[PDB]
Design a protein around this ligand. Structure first.
Ligand code: HEM
Ligand code: HEM
Lengths: 57, 444, 64, 48, 285, 108
């Protein structure tokens, strides 16, 4: 938890650094969740979707 | 002129150590009126819950007789020599001093020794002083400010004996015997930890001679290793409120962390208290006052009075505000207090730090006048530093303060801290603790 | 100059840094003396019922 | 008021301010970091 | 006015000085209630005119030299009675479980060996306690009252000194139904001291008390400023404390006995306030 | 002193929302009024989108709704949101009425 302490001291003191942190984290979280959503949605079916019979056709 | 040379012309406190671990200190000045005192590091912080109120009761029976001159011969001789005796005891320190003349000095030191070490204890005395001190507690359940400080310490240092008061709870006081007081005298009043300090027209070697007569040959010998040491006190940070709706005024105190004694953070927070500090409603020129908190509190009539203040203790302390106000203006008083705090934190400008430096110089110099406050500062400094640092170095440490270090310390000790909030009286319109914590920083 | 040695259900606290052996109460020394008195009486009666050459068998521990 | 002190909150506190000898200085940072990390993660979720 | 008169003793002082003078020493330090808002700037201007003259100004400097302050005072200062004794009483029902009775006659002017004798007299009768939470092992008034009434009380002497006149007496903070025994015990104690029962070591102890109190009065440099300024404006010039203390402890005992005789035999004035259901008025005193 | 206490909008907002004296012993049953307000603004927003894509003509109404559900991007989620938000509006409505009769706030 010592790593969490310097995390507080770097990214939760003021408003500008906090706001830049939550904006950059929101964009990276967008990126990661959209990749995870694509992976799970095209991983659960594997025999129905448009992808496999859009490259085989 | 030659004010820097005037700070160079400040007399120096000759400090030495007598062989029993005694810490002696002297200011040899040109005043025939003198003041001689003994400072003791034994407060209520070393007391337990079944030992609470020990040192207070010892102070009340330190003057009421001894094995040498019992009952009333002490008072008769001192009032026959015109000296004024005074004593106080705190949670951390206890002082006994005599304000006298240069030709009453050796009898004063000898009777001071007789007061300190030779305390005989009868039982009519413990009965009588028990009754009168319980009357004292009954009467001082009315003086509001000390009750506020007791509530604040009790909610601030929960578990450690720093939360205890000096007098302690009345129930432990009304049930003790001679034995626990005897244990207090045998354990705490010890020659290695006591300081003899004096000021006035008297030589350092003369006071050395008087100590070599009287204070050479004291106890100087502990019990079976049963010795106190400063445990690091656990400041919780919380709030207590005593709602009682029969009072005309309301008393609200708030406090945050302390610097202790060693760091120059204490100097910077004294600069902060010189910025705000005290205001009472018996002043003049209120609509044009320098402190903007006082400006708003006059222009809109917020409170009756306030003071923002420092209290320090061994490696710790409390720092904050105490105000007396009507119940209809608690919220705006607290709102403008948070506004002034955050204006000092985020916007430490030029002229306010200039005025704080000048006000703290003025406060220190006005504190150093009279033999008793100077010798008292000597005794408590040697129980908090081991040295009386002279005023030129004080001026140097003041001159090493800029607004940048000010807002560094203000970010360190004000910016979203966990406070201690004590409310007393008609405190219906006290703002809620989570709202106060949300108001501890404004993001804009 | 250390993380001050956290104790745990395996982390046995050694008798050097207690730190309760710093602000010792006089009644705690009295408790230590009473503990010495208990061990003194028990080992005294052990050596009574133990060194007897007239005795033959076991020590007959009531506590076990 | 001399008879007035607190009841214990040992049932409620976090283990860092549990012992009566440990200071509240170092226990501030990780506590503030945990709570404000929860708030910032909630903020990122609501914003997305 | 509210802040000042939150204490009863301010009312005691003001109604006492209203009770001893028909004249200018019976003025108040504070404004009355009906005069609030009923003042003129015209009286203020006339007061500034004929009171702030160049003849009534004392400029003292502690920390600055003579000629600089002297030159500033030259450059910027070019701008240019006998209160009789009333006699009697003032009684005010206040009812706060604190009976306050101040018993005061007229003593002497300011700056005299007779004023030193009245100061020695009040140090004989009893002053403020030398020991905090002490038990006052010298004041025979304290001992006679504690012999009499076993209640928490307050018996204190009092000496106001002024240019034209001056007041001496004592003052009691006592119980509701236990005031008269305290006051009459103090009265007969002062009578039996005035008979000629004066102790020479008590005289020397009172000399110690007066010397110590006057030397401790100039501990603060603002207090020393006050002493120097009031002495240089009252008696014309400052005098160092050596010969002043010499004339303090060079007074006689017959001065003290005759001063107590003047006090008791003189006609008394008094200020009584509180729940006064058991207060001896005049003829009982 | 305070912008919130001198500006006339923030006076009403302060005495209705921030410094409103409310009791303290409240379970989830008093959330329903705020939920009715949120459903109010949400249903107004969905109806606003629908009125930006709907025609009230009996020849073309059904085909216009089909155009919303199929041709218009996310018009199907907005139609379903308006309908099921009306349904949950009635749910919160009857829960609020049942609360007002059950705890006995009907004296007002
Ligand atoms: C039209 C939809 C309604 C809206 C938007 C609405 C709005 C509100 C709001 C915001 C509150 C305060 C917060 C709360 O207690 O939940 C409230 C309370 C209340 N409403 Fe309504 N309300 C509605 C319908 C009704 C109806 C139909 C009644 C019954 C006649 C009613 C009676 C009450 C009562 C008695 C309270 C106070 C409940 C208490 O103090 O415990 N409301 N309403
Ligand atoms: C003024 C704002 C509103 C507008 C402009 C509006 C507009 C519309 C339109 C155009 C329709 C027909 C399209 C459709 O059925 O999806 C509709 C249907 C409907 N609206 Fe609204 N509406 C509004 C407010 C409300 C409110 C406050 C409610 C009640 C919570 C509500 C409940 C319904 C229901 C139940 C339907 C039928 C849903 C269906 O059968 O598919 N509307 N609204």
């Amino acid at each position: 938890p010592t790593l969490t302490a310097r995390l507080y001291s770097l990214l939760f003191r003021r408003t500008s650094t906090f706001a830049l942190t939550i904006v950059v984290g929101a964009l990276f979280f967008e990126r990661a969740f959209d990749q995870g959503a694509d992976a799970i949605y095209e991983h659960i079916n594997e025999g129905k979707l448009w992808k496999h019979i859009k490259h085989k056709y | 002129a030659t004010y820097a040379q005037a700070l160079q012309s400040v007399p120096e406190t000759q400090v030495s150590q007598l062989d029993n671990g005694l810490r002696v200190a002297s200011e040899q000045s040109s005043q025939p009126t003198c003041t001689v005192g003994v400072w003791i590091d034994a407060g209520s912080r070393y007391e337990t819950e079944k030992n609470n109120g020990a040192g207070y009761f010892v102070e009340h029976l330190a003057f009421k007789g001894t094995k040498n001159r019992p009952g009333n011969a002490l008072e008769k001789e001192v009032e026959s020599m015109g000296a004024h005796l005074n004593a106080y005891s705190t949670r951390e320190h206890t002082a006994y001093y005599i304000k006298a003349l240069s030709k009453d000095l050796p009898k004063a030191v000898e009777l001071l020794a007789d007061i300190v070490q030779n305390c005989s204890l009868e039982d009519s005395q413990i009965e009588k002083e028990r009754d009168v001190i319980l009357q004292e507690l009954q009467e001082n359940d009315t003086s509001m400010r000390d009750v506020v400080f007791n509530y604040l310490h009790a909610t601030a240092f929960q578990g450690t004996p720093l939360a205890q008061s000096v007098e302690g709870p009345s129930e432990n006081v009304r049930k003790l015997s001679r034995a626990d007081l005897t244990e207090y005298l045998s354990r705490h009043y010890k020659a290695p930890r006591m300081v003899l300090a004096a000021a006035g027209g008297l030589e350092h070697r003369q006071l050395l001679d008087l100590a070599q007569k009287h204070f050479s040959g004291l106890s100087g010998t502990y019990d079976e290793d049963a010795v106190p040491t400063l445990t690091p006190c656990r400041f919780t940070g919380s709030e207590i409120r005593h709602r009682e709706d029969g009072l005309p005024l309301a008393h609200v105190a708030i406090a945050v962390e302390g610097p202790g004694w060693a760091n120059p953070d204490n100097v910077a927070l004294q600069v902060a208290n010189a910025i705000i500090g005290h205001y009472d409603c018996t002043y003049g020129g209120g609509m044009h006052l320098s402190s903007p908190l006082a400006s708003v509190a006059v222009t809109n009539k917020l409170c009756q009075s306030f003071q923002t203040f420092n209290i320090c203790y061994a490696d710790t302390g409390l720092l904050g505000a105490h105000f007396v106000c009507d119940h209809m203006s608690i919220d705006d008083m607290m709102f403008v207090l948070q506004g002034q705090w955050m204006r000092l934190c985020t916007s430490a400008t030029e002229s306010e730090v200039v005025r704080g430096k000048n006000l703290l110089r003025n406060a220190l110099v006005s504190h150093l006048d009279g033999t008793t406050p100077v010798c008292e500062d000597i005794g408590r400094s040697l129980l908090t530093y081991g040295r009386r640092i002279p005023l030129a170095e004080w001026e140097s440490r003041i001159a090493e303060v800029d607004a940048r270090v000010v807002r560094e310390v203000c970010s360190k000790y004000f910016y979203d801290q966990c406070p201690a909030v004590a409310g007393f009286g008609p405190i219906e319109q006290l703002p809620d603790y989570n709202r106060i914590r949300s108001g501890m920083f404004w993001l804009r | 100059s250390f993380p001050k040695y956290e104790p745990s259900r395996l982390a046995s606290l050694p008798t050097t840094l207690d730190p309760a052996e710093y602000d010792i109460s006089s009644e705690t020394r009295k408790a230590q003396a009473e503990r010495l008195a208990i061990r003194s009486r028990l080992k005294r009666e052990y050596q009574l019922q133990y060194n007897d050459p007239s005795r033959r068998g076991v020590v007959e521990d009531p506590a076990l | 008021h001399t008879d007035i002190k607190v009841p214990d909150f040992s049932d409620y506190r976090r283990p860092e301010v549990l012992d009566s000898t440990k200071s509240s200085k170092e226990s501030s940072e990780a506590r503030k970091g945990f709570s404000y990390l929860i708030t910032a993660t909630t903020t990122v979720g609501v914003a997305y | 006015k509210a802040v000042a008169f939150q204490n009863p003793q301010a009312h005691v002082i003001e109604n006492l000085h209203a009770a001893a003078y028909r004249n200018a020493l019976a003025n108040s330090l504070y404004c009355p209630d009906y005069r609030i808002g009923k003042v003129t700037p015209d009286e203020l201007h006339d007061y500034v005119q004929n009171h702030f003259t160049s003849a009534r100004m004392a400029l003292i400097g502690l920390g600055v030299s003579h000629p600089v302050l002297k030159q500033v005072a030259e450059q910027f200062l070019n701008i240019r009675a006998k209160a009789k004794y009333r006699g009697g009483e003032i009684r005010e029902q206040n009812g706060d479980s604190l009976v306050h009775a101040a018993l005061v006659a007229e003593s002497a002017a300011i700056g005299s060996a007779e004023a030193n004798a009245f100061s020695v007299l009040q140090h004989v009768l009893g002053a403020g306690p030398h020991v905090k939470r002490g038990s006052n092992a010298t004041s025979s008034l304290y001992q006679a009252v504690a012999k009499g009434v076993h209640q928490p009380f307050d018996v204190s002497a009092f000496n106001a000194s002024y240019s034209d006149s001056g007041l001496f007496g004592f003052y009691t903070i006592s119980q509701a139904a236990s005031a008269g025994d305290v006051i009459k015990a103090a009265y007969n104690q002062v009578k039996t001291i005035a008979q000629g029962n004066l102790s020479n070591p008590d005289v020397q102890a009172a000399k110690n008390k007066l010397k110590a109190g006057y030397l401790m009065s100039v501990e603060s440099s603002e207090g020393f400023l006050d002493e120097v300024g009031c002495q240089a404006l009252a008696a014309g010039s400052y005098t160092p404390p050596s010969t002043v203390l010499q004339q303090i402890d060079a007074v006689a005992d017959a001065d003290v006995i005759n001063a107590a005789k003047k006090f008791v035999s003189g006609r008394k004035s008094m200020a009584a306030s509180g729940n006064l259901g058991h207060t001896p008025f005049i003829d009982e005193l | 002193i305070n912008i919130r206490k001198t500006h006339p909008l923030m006076k009403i907002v302060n005495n209705a929302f921030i410094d409103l004296p409310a009791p303290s012993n409240i379970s989830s049953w008093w959330n329903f009024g705020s939920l009715l307000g949120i459903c109010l603004i949400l249903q107004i927003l969905t109806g606003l989108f629908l009125a930006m894509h709907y025609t009230p003509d009996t020849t073309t109404a059904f085909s216009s709704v089909t155009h919303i559900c199929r041709d218009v991007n996310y018009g199907w989620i907005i139609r379903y949101m308006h309908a099921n938000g009306a349904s949950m509006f009635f749910i919160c409505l009857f829960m609020h009425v049942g609360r007002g009769l059950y705890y006995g706030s009907y004296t007002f």
